[PDB]
């Protein structure tokens, strides 16, 4: 359980680093606009 | 000793030994290959 434990840490890793660049992106387009 | 007829059966020594899954496509690779490429996807 501990190697899917490793996994799926990965996983989340990979969303919570999209939903940050969201973030940033969104913050830069506020600033444009 | 005594008096055998002809062979009413012929017979010799012989040898007697003991007599596709669902998703058997994936065999060729390995399950940690694919585990891997999913991850290696989503990381792509």
């Given at each position: 359980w501990s190697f899917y434990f490793g996994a799926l840490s990965?996983?989340?890793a990979e969303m919570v680093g999209v939903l940050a660049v969201h973030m940033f992106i969104?913050?830069?387009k506020q600033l444009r606009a | 000793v005594i008096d055998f007829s002809k062979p009413?059966?012929?017979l010799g020594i012989s040898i007697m030994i003991k007599?596709?899954?669902v998703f058997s496509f994936l065999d060729?690779?390995?399950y940690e290959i694919w585990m891997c490429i999913v991850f290696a996807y989503i990381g792509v």
């Open positions: 990965f996983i989340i969104d913050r830069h | 009413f059966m012929s007599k596709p899954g060729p690779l390995a």
